[PDB]
Amino acid sequence: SAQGLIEVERKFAPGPDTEERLQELGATLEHRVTFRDTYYDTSELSLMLSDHWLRQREGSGWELKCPGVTGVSGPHNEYVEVTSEAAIVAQLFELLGSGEQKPAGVAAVLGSLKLQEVASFITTRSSWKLALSGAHGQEPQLTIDLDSADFGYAVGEVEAMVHEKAEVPAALEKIITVSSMLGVPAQEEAPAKLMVYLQRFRPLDYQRLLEAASSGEATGDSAS
């Protein structure tokens, strides 16, 4: 087994005091992102289910998720995200069936094609780093990255790097133990905010997607 430092990650579902608990436990706040992600869709959630996910973040800019294939034929060849408005403008027009003049920006197509904000919540990402220690002194520093949302959602992903597969159970069990103390060990293929929107309000619809989008970071002892 030679892949270098084995990034061992497992997923955890934390409570509402996680950030505080981490500070007190000794995890450092590496970085955190906070923004409201505003999702638009047609009235039927046709956009959502069409693999064209439309989101604006913090009123900064626009982001559209496309199934790789824009001339949708066949399966979804991965997701391609476009952030350039002119692309989204033209895309939204063809998506909703406009045939009209390209306005200028996405906010203009938004009002004109009359999309509805069907989902809006805040993404709270919080990256913590926890140094292991004990009688041995220096033990690995592992990262805990929290992904949370306004609509009842909190996930942590705990990732440590060991160069030895033999210390994987050691590091990984520390991970699970601290996590179970803080909340409950999870197992999902990492939910995006919208994956949460779905599991929260539309569980079977979430499953349609989940079963197909089942690719998340959680290996165990072998990254590769």
Q: Is 189 annotated as a binding residue?
A: no
Q: Is 65 annotated as a binding residue?
A: yes
Count other C-beta atoms under 10 Å from residue 75's C-beta.
11
What is the distance between the alpha carbons of residues 172 and 118, in angstroms, rounded to a whole number?
39
Q: Is 114 annotated as a binding residue?
A: no
What is the distance between the alpha carbons of residues 120 and 37, in angstroms, rounded to a whole number?
6
Count other C-beta atoms under 10 Å from residue 123's C-beta.
20
Q: Is 125 annotated as a binding residue?
A: yes
Q: Is 200 annotated as a binding residue?
A: no
Q: Is 165 annotated as a binding residue?
A: no
Which three-class secondary structure string do you get for the chain? Answer: CCCCCEEEEEEEEECCCHHHHHHHHCCEEEEEEEEEEEEEECCCCHHHHCCCEEEEECCCEEEEEECCCCCCCCCCCCCEEECCHHHHHHHHHHHHCCCCCCCCCHHHHHHHHCCEEEEEEEEEEEEEEEECCCCCCCCCEEEEEEEEECCCEEEEEEEEEECCHHHHHHHHHHHHHHHHHHEEECCCCCCCHHHHHHHHHCHHHHHHHHHHCCCCCCCCCCCC
Which residues are part of a known binding site for substrate? Answer: 11, 55, 57, 65, 125, 157, 193
Which residues are part of a known binding site for Mg(2+)? Answer: 7, 9, 145, 157, 159
Which residues are part of a known binding site? Answer: 7, 9, 11, 55, 57, 65, 125, 145, 157, 159, 193
